[PDB]
Amino acid sequence: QSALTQPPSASGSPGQSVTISCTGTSSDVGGSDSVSWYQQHPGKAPKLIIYEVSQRPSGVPNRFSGSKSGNTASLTVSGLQAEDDADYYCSSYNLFFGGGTKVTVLGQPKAAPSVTLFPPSSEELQANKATLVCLISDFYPGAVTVAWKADSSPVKAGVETTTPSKQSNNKYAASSYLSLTPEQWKSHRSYSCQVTHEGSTVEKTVAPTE
Amino acid sequence: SALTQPPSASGSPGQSVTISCTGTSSDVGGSDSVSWYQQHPGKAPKLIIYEVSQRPSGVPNRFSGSKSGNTASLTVSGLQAEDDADYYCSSYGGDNNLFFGGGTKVTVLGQPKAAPSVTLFPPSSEELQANKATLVCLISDFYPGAVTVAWKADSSPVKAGVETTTPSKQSNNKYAASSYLSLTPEQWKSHRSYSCQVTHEGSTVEKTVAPTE
Ligand SMILES: CC1=NC(NN/C=C/Cc2ccccc2[N+](=O)[O-])=NC(=O)C1
């Protein structure tokens, strides 16, 4: 979990606006005008687009604006263009990072994920494995976050999630798996997979059977 | 205003690699606010060095930073698979005066071939009540990151409704993928079994599941 809190994702068609938030404490965001925003194209070096909450370096157009209210800073991108499709990170100066927001300029219609939660198979149990798998298919944009629950409360370790890939129907698919031991699986009431895409969250629950 | 890094560098497990960040006398040369960041593809960046040489809490002493004139260096000793990532330098001069290097892709050489774990899941109770019978074949812990998948209905090849994700690198430094077959309840219930066959480096592994009793 990132020292600063940014929504995972955001999207618009060309010419639309997107606003993205970055929340900290009075110790960082809420005490000093030292919030920066970075634009990073997958594979490339980051570009500084805002510093000290609101300042644009030279070459950064006025489409990009930065504001701060109490313990939360926002970056607004107006008139979205192709080239604005990237990862956006905030920071606060020691130095604290947000977890990043994937900003998509819609290349096709939005599609909500199909989510299927599989309990452990017979065969893997007899190998002392209780890996759960949350299959997430047929979504756009190709940005998703997965949380896992044990009973009525969050779980931490175990969780792996694949990088979403574009399938034959031109929508994205990914897999989140929780590598449980049979003892962990058999000793809880239920486990749950929570899939967040385009600000809506889907929950699936499974429990052990006989 | 950019800093200059070599685009690529490599080393063997247990060995060192040194990577440079060349600035001017007014960025790197003009102050000791040189940072280094580690970034795994798809992930947020992590600060590993600030003020030329200082490690944040939780960064091992395998990572060391120095500076000589307008060039700053990062050394990673005891190279491990987790160290395979992009490394960026920055220099900070107070205003808009934050400058970045273009990044160095650090490869850890000689990661050993690893065969996949293959786990095949029959349809969940919940999707069957929702008139769906998708199967998933989880393929994890393999290296290198190329697999081919084939499905069978009973003994017969399946040629339609198969999708396999592009293998991605997970936190154990090995590749995972999923192959899913989107059957109807009627297709699932009318066959004796479905099988997923995973081929990796010319070796083949097959799993079979059957409608439950
Ligand atoms: C001294 C100060 N240092 C910094 N460093 N910011 C570093 C940011 C680095 C970053 C951001 C987004 C994506 C990738 C990366 N990366 O370097 O890998 N920001 C400040 O305001 C002040």
Would you say residue A89 lies in a domain?
Answer: yes
Q: Are residues A68 and A86 located together in one domain of the fold?
A: yes
Which residue of chain A comes nearest to B86, CA vs CA? A43
- For residue B59 the two structure tokens come to 């960064």
**Shortest alpha-carbon distance between residue A112 and chain B (Å):** 17
Show contacts of B123-132: CB within 8 Å, 24+ apart: B123/B183, B123/B185, B123/B188, B124/A116, B124/A117, B124/A118, B124/A119, B124/A206, B126/A116, B126/A117, B126/A204, B126/A206, B127/A116, B128/B185, B128/B188, B131/B184, B131/B185, B132/A116, B132/B182, B132/B184, B132/B185
- For residue A93 the two structure tokens come to 């100066």
**Partner-chain residue, chosen from B47, B124, B166, that has the shortest CB–CB distance to A118:** B124
Would you say residue B1 lies in a domain?
Answer: no
Q: Are residues A66 and A143 located together in one domain of the fold?
A: no
Question: Chain B contacts of A121, Cβ < 8 Å?
Answer: 119-122, 209
For the domain that residue A151 is a member of, what is the CATH number? 2.60.40.10
Q: Are residues A98 and A122 located together in one domain of the fold?
A: no
Please give the distance of CA A203 from its chain centroid, rounded to a whole number: 16
Closest CA to B111 of B155, B76, B157, B80: B80
Closest CA to B173 of B143, B151, B211: B143
Which residue of chain B comes nearest to A90, CA vs CA? B44
Would you say residue A1 lies in a domain?
Answer: no
Quoted resolution (Å): 2.0
What secondary structure, in 3-state letters, does chain A show?
CCCEECCCEEEECCCCCEEEEEECCCCCCCCCCCEEEEEECCCCCCEEEEECCCECCCCCCCCEEEEEECCEEEEEECCCCHHHCEEEEEEECCCEEECCEEEEECCCCCECCEEEEECCCHHHHCCCCEEEEEEEEEEECCCCEEEEEECCEECCCCEEECCCEECCCCCEEEEEEEEECHHHHHCCCCEEEEEEECCEEEEEEECCCC
The C-alpha atoms of residue B128 and residue B137 are separated, in whole angstroms, by 17
Task: Count how many residues are written for chain A.
Answer: 210
A40 C-beta closer than 6 A to ligand 1: yes
Closest CA to B33 of B76, B80, B65, B1: B65
Contact (CB, 8 A) for B32 and B52: yes
Q: Which residues of A touch B (CB under 8 A)?
A: 2, 36, 42-48, 51, 55, 57-58, 89, 94-95, 97-100, 116-119, 121, 123-124, 129, 131, 133, 135, 137, 160, 162-165, 167-168, 173-175, 177, 204, 206
Closest CA to A166 of B140, B163, B151, B196: B163
Q: Are residues A33 and A58 located together in one domain of the fold?
A: yes
Closest CA to A179 of A163, A193, A194, A159: A159
Which residue of chain A comes nearest to B137, CA vs CA? A133
A95 C-beta closer than 6 A to ligand 1: yes
- Residue B159 CB burial class (10 angstroms; 0-12, 13-18, ≥19): exposed
Number of domains in chain A: 2
- Residue B202 CB burial class (10 angstroms; 0-12, 13-18, ≥19): exposed
The C-alpha atoms of residue A160 and residue B169 are separated, in whole angstroms, by 10
Cα Rg of chain A (Å, integer): 20
The C-alpha atoms of residue A205 and residue B125 are separated, in whole angstroms, by 11
Per DSSP bridges, beta strands A18-23 and A9-12 are: unpaired
B210 CA → ligand 1 middle, Å = 52
Question: Chain B contacts of A123, Cβ < 8 Å?
Answer: 119-120, 207, 209
Which residues precede chain breaks (C–N over 2.5 Å) in chain A? 93
β-bridge mates for residue A103, sequence order = A10, A86
Q: Do B176 and A174 touch (CB under 8 A)?
A: no
Residue where a domain terminates, one of B45, B73, B108: B108
Would you say residue A29 lies in a domain?
Answer: yes
- For residue B123 the two structure tokens come to 């349809």
Residue where a domain terminates, one of A56, A86, A105: A105
DSSP characters over chain B: --BB--SEEEE-TT--EEEEEE--TTTGGG-S-EEEEEE-TTS--EEEEBTTTBPPTT--TTEEEEEETTEEEEEE-S--GGG-EEEEEEEE-SSS-EEEB--EEEEEP----BPPEEEEE---HHHHHTT-EEEEEEEEEEBSS--EEEEEETTEEE-SSEEEPPPEE-TTSSEEEEEEEEE-HHHHHHSS-EEEEEEETTEEEEEEE----
> Domain range spanning residue A16?
9-105
> What b/e string do you get for B116-136 counting C-beta neighbours within 10 Å, with b at 16 or more?
bbbbbbbbbebbbeeebbbbb
